[PDB]
Ligand binder design. Structure first.
Ligand SMILES: OC[C@H]1O[C@H](O[C@H]2[C@@H](O)[C@H](O)[C@@H](CO)O[C@@H]2O)[C@@H](O)[C@@H](O)[C@@H]1O
Ligand SMILES: [Ca+2]
Ligand SMILES: [Ca+2]
Length: 230
């Protein structure tokens, strides 16, 4: 097991997430993102919303882990459109891609709620690498652009969902706790990419959006760790 060192300057959590200025320390909020004390509501359950939180400053970690705790809540069996967890070269503030800009340099892990391509394969968790040249294909849930993916129902859980995403030794892994139980540490394997290269310095980002249907997408915490091989 690599040793995990916490990096607060790249992190946020309650019970006092928003400062009186309305800011969350070390992070920048844009669009329809709403910061509260317990969480950020990155997109509210309204039609056509885009939100996003990014770290102010770049990080140069050879290996890192990010732990993200969230909820996607909707009235109905079906919800839209999802979340995206980001590690890129530049903060991407506005885009068609879950509310963040298209043509990114880095990797986005997308928790896609809505079945655009009507394959009946949603909700899904997708991993997509990009070098600044790709254009994400929404209409297709980016099915053709995935490095890897899993199917996972992250909507309407009794407890918050958590995603543990690790870049260690050129491997990007995604573990999910499905919110079935109060046990925090109950992760199951969702997906991995091997031999993956991403930028040496980057911004850790979170984005959300809604279209014709909408859910509230809330992030309780974002915690970042640098990892060292021991
Ligand atoms: O936000 C859901 C979906 O909304 C829009 O898609 C249309 C299409 O999915 C169907 O005709 C229904 C959905 O109930 O009406 C929508 O207008 C698009 O905005 C799309 O981006 C999004 O996935
Ligand atoms: Ca699909
Ligand atoms: Ca989709």
């Amino acid at each position: 097991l690599p040793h995990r060192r916490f990096e607060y300057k790249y992190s946020f959590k309650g019970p006092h997430l928003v400062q009186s200025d309305g800011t969350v320390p070390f992070w920048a909020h844009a669009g329809n993102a709403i910061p509260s004390s317990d969480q950020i509501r990155v997109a509210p359950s309204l039609k056509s919303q885009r939100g996003s939180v990014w770290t102010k400053t770049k990080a140069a970690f050879e290996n890192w882990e990010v732990e993200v705790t969230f909820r996607v809540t909707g009235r109905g069996r079906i919800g839209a459109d999802g979340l995206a967890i980001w590690y890129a070269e530049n903060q991407g503030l506005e885009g068609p891609v879950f509310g963040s800009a298209d043509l990114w340099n880095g990797v986005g892990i997308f928790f896609d709620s809505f079945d655009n391509d009507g394959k009946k394969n949603n909700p899904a968790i997708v991993i997509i690498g990009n070098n600044g040249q790709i254009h994400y294909d929404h209409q297709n849930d980016g099915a053709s652009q995935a490095l890897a993916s899993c199917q996972r129902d992250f909507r309407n859980k009794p407890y918050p969902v958590r995603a543990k995403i690790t870049y260690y030794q050129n491997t990007l892994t995604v573990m999910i706790n499905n919110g079935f139980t109060p046990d925090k540490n109950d992760y199951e394997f969702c997906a991995k990419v091997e031999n993956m290269i991403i930028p040496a310095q980057g911004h850790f980002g979170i984005s959300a959006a809604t279209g014709g249907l909408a859910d509230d997408h809330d992030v309780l915490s974002f915690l970042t760790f640098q990892l060292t091989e021991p």
